[PDB]
Amino acid sequence: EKLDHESVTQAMQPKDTPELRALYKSFEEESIIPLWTQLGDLMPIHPKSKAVPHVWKWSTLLRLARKSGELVPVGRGGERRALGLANPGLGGNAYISPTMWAGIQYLGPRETAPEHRHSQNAFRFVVEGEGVWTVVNGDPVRMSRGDLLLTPGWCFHGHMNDTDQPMAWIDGLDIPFSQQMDVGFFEFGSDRVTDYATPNFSRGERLWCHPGLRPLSGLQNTVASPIGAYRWEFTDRALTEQLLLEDEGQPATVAPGHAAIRYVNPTTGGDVMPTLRCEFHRLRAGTETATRNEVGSTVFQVFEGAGAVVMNGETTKLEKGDMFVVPSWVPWSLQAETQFDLFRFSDAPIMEALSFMRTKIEGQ
Amino acid sequence: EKLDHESVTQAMQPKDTPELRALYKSFEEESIIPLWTQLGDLMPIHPKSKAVPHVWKWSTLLRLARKSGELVPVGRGGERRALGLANPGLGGNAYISPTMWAGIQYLGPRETAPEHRHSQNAFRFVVEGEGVWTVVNGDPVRMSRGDLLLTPGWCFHGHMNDTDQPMAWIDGLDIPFSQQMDVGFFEFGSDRVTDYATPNFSRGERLWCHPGLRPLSGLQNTVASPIGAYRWEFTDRALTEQLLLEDEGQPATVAPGHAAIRYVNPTTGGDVMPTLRCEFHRLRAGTETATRNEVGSTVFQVFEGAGAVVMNGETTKLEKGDMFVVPSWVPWSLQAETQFDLFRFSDAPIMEALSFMRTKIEGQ
Amino acid sequence: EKLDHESVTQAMQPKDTPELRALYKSFEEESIIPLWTQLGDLMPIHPKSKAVPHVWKWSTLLRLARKSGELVPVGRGGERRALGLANPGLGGNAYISPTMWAGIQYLGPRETAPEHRHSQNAFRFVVEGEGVWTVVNGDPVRMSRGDLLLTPGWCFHGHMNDTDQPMAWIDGLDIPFSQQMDVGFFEFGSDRVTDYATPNFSRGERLWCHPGLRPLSGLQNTVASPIGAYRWEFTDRALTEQLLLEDEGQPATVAPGHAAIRYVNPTTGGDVMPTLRCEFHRLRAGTETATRNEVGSTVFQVFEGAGAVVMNGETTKLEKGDMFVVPSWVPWSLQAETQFDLFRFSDAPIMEALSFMRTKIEGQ
Amino acid sequence: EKLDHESVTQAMQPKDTPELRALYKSFEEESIIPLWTQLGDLMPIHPKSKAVPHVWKWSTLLRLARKSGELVPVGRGGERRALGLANPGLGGNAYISPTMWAGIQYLGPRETAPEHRHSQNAFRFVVEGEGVWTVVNGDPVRMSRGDLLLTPGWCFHGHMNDTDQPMAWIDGLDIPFSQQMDVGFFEFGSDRVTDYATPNFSRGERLWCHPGLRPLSGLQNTVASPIGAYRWEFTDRALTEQLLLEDEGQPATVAPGHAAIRYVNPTTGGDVMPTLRCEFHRLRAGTETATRNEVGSTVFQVFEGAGAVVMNGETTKLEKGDMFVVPSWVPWSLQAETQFDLFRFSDAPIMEALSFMRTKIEGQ
Numbered sequence A, B, C, D: 001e002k003l004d005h006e007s008v009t010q011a012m013q014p015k016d017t018p019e020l021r022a023l024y025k026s027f028e029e030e031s032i033i034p035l036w037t038q039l040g041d042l043m044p045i046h047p048k049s050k051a052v053p054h055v056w057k058w059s060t061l062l063r064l065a066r067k068s069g070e071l072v073p074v075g076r077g078g079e080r081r082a083l084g085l086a087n088p089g090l091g092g093n094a095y096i097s098p099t100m101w102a103g104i105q106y107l108g109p110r111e112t113a114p115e116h117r118h119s120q121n122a123f124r125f126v127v128e129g130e131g132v133w134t135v136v137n138g139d140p141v142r143m144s145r146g147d148l149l150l151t152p153g154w155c156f157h158g159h160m161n162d163t164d165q166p167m168a169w170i171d172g173l174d175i176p177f178s179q180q181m182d183v184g185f186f187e188f189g190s191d192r193v194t195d196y197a198t199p200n201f202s203r204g205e206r207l208w209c210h211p212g213l214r215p216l217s218g219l220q221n222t223v224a225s226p227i228g229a230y231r232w233e234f235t236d237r238a239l240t241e242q243l244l245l246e247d248e249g250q251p252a253t254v255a256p257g258h259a260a261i262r263y264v265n266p267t268t269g270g271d272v273m274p275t276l277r278c279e280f281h282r283l284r285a286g287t288e289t290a291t292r293n294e295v296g297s298t299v300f301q302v303f304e305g306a307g308a309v310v311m312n313g314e315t316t317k318l319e320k321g322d323m324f325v326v327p328s329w330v331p332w333s334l335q336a337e338t339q340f341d342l343f344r345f346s347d348a349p350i351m352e353a354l355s356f357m358r359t360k361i362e363g364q
């Protein structure tokens, strides 16, 4: 039980003879690899990701995105002026974790990013800015500060800046999962967006964003949320109410001074998309979360306030827009200096769907 | 296939002899009843309810409720000054249909209706009035015009009029189902309500009424909705948006000029309670719905405007507050003279859960 | 909490005046019934069925069925020479409980019972006999001692005696539920059965009765089991193995000396049909089950051995073939004198689907 | 729509200036990778696995396994004398596909392989041999020709040869998925097996292998099958019956002359384990399956008879024991020369759980 791969007796060490070396040589020629030389690496005691905890500064991401807006035109082929966060441990792949892409995207004055679709699921999140509409299956969706915008797999999407000012946001996708697992399909759509209109609220929201109500034309459940925009207003109100209810001595917050919501598919009560979980957390000044180990990877973006993250015992100070990744089973906690708002995403739906999820919480 | 119980050959007619009569007599003594004398009644070609279509006028219901407020005190024992709509076909039982109670309730100035709970599921709907709070598991819930209020089975509930003016509403319960099926439990609670405070919005709403958002403290799914109030604002907005989207040529309405929503449990996307489905319909002036036959019973209350219902080919003119029941498989349609808003409930979740549901729609 | 409808203060007793009597008279004229005169009956503290516990002797059921085979021809119209057990508490209805029909059926030498279908779900169980095939959607299904045969709602079924000797079995249906709830449809099929062949095993069994295996042509889940026959061999083997595993000190039996199985839909792991649960119990000699209160009704048939049932504290000695009903919430236990085998059915799937199920077990 | 990554206009080619090269250099320093240089590789038109179709000959696998039994002792540390099939396209990883390990394992006379558990799900399949018991959570499970044995994640398992003759089998696991996704946990158990007894049938089978029957002590559904052994008898009988039913003109086979089953979890009707689907196929002599493209990877082992596989248009002749892998979206078909039996496994449950599954069938 307490034994690990370092301390266990190694009882399968063959005698090193010419017959043994010839056996190993013939394994190579036959595309055979023995378990007994490999076991501890293939099957660790607990997860040990090649990805490392890492933090990217928003100020740095903005500088690089802005310079890219100056030097690189957006359009067909390359599709998006998007910069992926590449984990230092992941071999030069544009993967923030083994399952997820997280990237900054920049659309300059009056630019269009052309329409396409792909089996890969996607969302947009906005720490700051306005001006862009993303048109999802023909339905123009305004992008504003604090909004989560969804683009489920196989939905046509294109983006356009309707103003004379640049805008930046983050993209999350299951690109790394999808590449390694061979589930990717892609289709080019129109070179412009199919609708340039700029309504305040999308058709999706107009049908689906009334609490506890479901259109009779929408009684079929969906694999992904039909809500195209989870607007900041509602997120802000939800979190405030939780802290207000806590004041009044009423259950609501997930832990003391820790308000939090999960963005959900309203047809099921489940996650927004099959591979991706999105959450939003608001911590009271002075709140320190209990340290968690969780299977699978998570990424946060600081939306507002000041604080720190601790990963593997290491404290990193965080500011507005900063992004960090916690790989599988890395102990993590957040510490709020001011009231501390963060946007969160993860691959937890994959882990939970396949019964791989485990959680260790300090004090429990 | 085209044969029915009237036209089929009756091939089990025994010879009427003293031996046969002695056999039938001994069936009675042994508590045995033969199928062959009974078949057509026990197993009809299509449903043939003992309940009949029937309409009750709100003006009449109000008169009787008001007089009851003058002559009958509310309190313990009797519990509620509630008048049940009793279907003429249902043998003197206080059943609007074989599954459902529908009733008018009246609470006068400053009165309290004391706390209790029961396995029977319940909701309140308000065509008109204000002043009452219903306190559900200690959580005061304001009752206003156009609101649906829920009281799932086994939740403690009491009601109090916080003003000097009377209020009336309708109650729906699965009382008849629960009586006939032997599932009823009941417990007396406090003689007053446990909280006299009168907040604008309940704790339940404050956690659960933000579209597409779920508290992390509420990740467990519930058998009934945790939303205690489905406020008129949202219902009205939903219905308007559907008619607006229809104008713009966009799918939304369930049929031409027919906007409609289903009130739902946000943890599942399903019905508010296991036995009871609630809906709200808004018809454009001049809309006539396609005639439907549906398994199980439904009840409507006219919330606003003027129109008619047709049941079994018979037109009945309807006004604000009027209530009608459509028993199982009775052909029904609605005709809007002005824009015509109706609140709807039914036992459809029971039928659908047990795979008994069938639907015939005229033109399909 | 400890108050009941007998001991609670009755605080809604109006003054008995001509104005009050005129109010009550006008309730009658308007088809209105007040809650306050009715409450305790409509909403009891715990279930109080109109059905009573009752036992029918197989010797008596056989005598009556045999005499019916002499005096009453089987055929069209009457459809089946079936005798329903009619609960003394259920008003002359051919209902063994408020939800279920339980009946003895008799098919004499060479007789055919013609084909039909109905939304009502059905099963056959055989304490004794052979010779009959029931043809279900064209698929001949042999009927033998100890077999459970299924006939899910809307499946065409007819029965024929292929021998010169009579056979009797029991039928269970959701007839009473279906009548009271208005879900019944019925269709006459062919006057004879569509296939007179008499294979040992049906096509359904040949596809579906291999443990842990599912045909690739059957990947769609079904609302009812596609297994047409649950043969005695497997039931007997299952129960024996549980008692053997218990001997070996291994978990298997549901309680000490109490082996039991539930017949299941193999596509879901759930109940055989939406309204009806079937089980088979085998008790070691000397086993006495802990007393249970359960919501909803259950019926047993003694298949073999000798024992007793206790209901409401009353012991009734039982022999092979005897049948008894336990209405909702009646305390019940079984006592085995010899090894005691019983077939069981109930309306528990209805109760569980609608979250009405409760269970009290003595000692827990 | 018809455009691909080769033929699309590349409109994001920046001017190659020192400012651009400095921008790209600073991307490297900041752990940023741009989408626009990467798009076509990250997001292909359809899947394009690094894994290639490949076939391994059983004669070759046996030779290498036998020599390993001579030169390499089995025991602690290395754990298993197992040889993994390593796809030539997968970079030297011991992965037959991106999701699955498939390997030959060899246990010589009287040897024990010691107990352990791991989150990785596993099964054993036997083309030939007898003598080994695998003890799963203390429950000895006989291993015989044609049997599928399961070892769901986190179950303690060890293996022992109870005879004087060697035995070989194949192992399938979700090792590659689990490594790349960081879900692996591992625990060492006892150095020997905890029970050396050698019963014909395990406790799991004795509870769970009776068709359509479920123990009342097992009403809780499981994430993986509780059946530890899917014995050849039942698999053989199922397949025969399908071909017999086809002869009789009755629906059963999945395609003409193509009998097939899926091994299932009896508590749900679903797959044996969350990550792994197992099937068994029997083709009539002369049957050629319609060509399929399927998302995700599959592996077959020829159990009996002679035939061929076609992958990417290439025919490879197959004999008893031979193994082949079809990576994601590779067109594949089987051709039977004699009656042709194959065991199949795949990662299809992962694809279906996450809504990534697509299927193209030739002629449909």
Ligand SMILES: O=C(O)c1ccccc1O
Pocket: A080, A082, A101, A103, A105, A122, A157, A171, A173, D035
């Ligand atoms: O569609 C996008 O905006 C996008 C952004 C980043 C990565 C892949 C994408 O398709």
Ligand SMILES: O=C(O)c1ccccc1O
Pocket: B080, B082, B101, B103, B105, B122, B157, B171, B173, C035
């Ligand atoms: O609780 C109520 O207000 C009520 C109203 C009508 C019928 C039964 C009830 O419990």
Ligand SMILES: O=C(O)c1ccccc1O
Pocket: B035, C080, C082, C101, C103, C105, C122, C157, C171, C173
């Ligand atoms: O089909 C039958 O055999 C039957 C038996 C009893 C009651 C109703 C029925 O349809």
Ligand SMILES: O=C(O)c1ccccc1O
Pocket: A035, D080, D082, D101, D103, D105, D122, D157, D171, D173
């Ligand atoms: O337990 C096994 O036999 C085994 C076999 C191959 C790979 C990993 C394993 O744990």
Ligand SMILES: [Fe+2]
Pocket: A116, A118, A122, A157
């Ligand atoms: Fe995209």
Ligand SMILES: [Fe+2]
Pocket: B116, B118, B122, B157
């Ligand atoms: Fe009540």
Ligand SMILES: [Fe+2]
Pocket: C116, C118, C122, C157
């Ligand atoms: Fe019938």
Ligand SMILES: [Fe+2]
Pocket: D116, D118, D122, D157
């Ligand atoms: Fe293992």
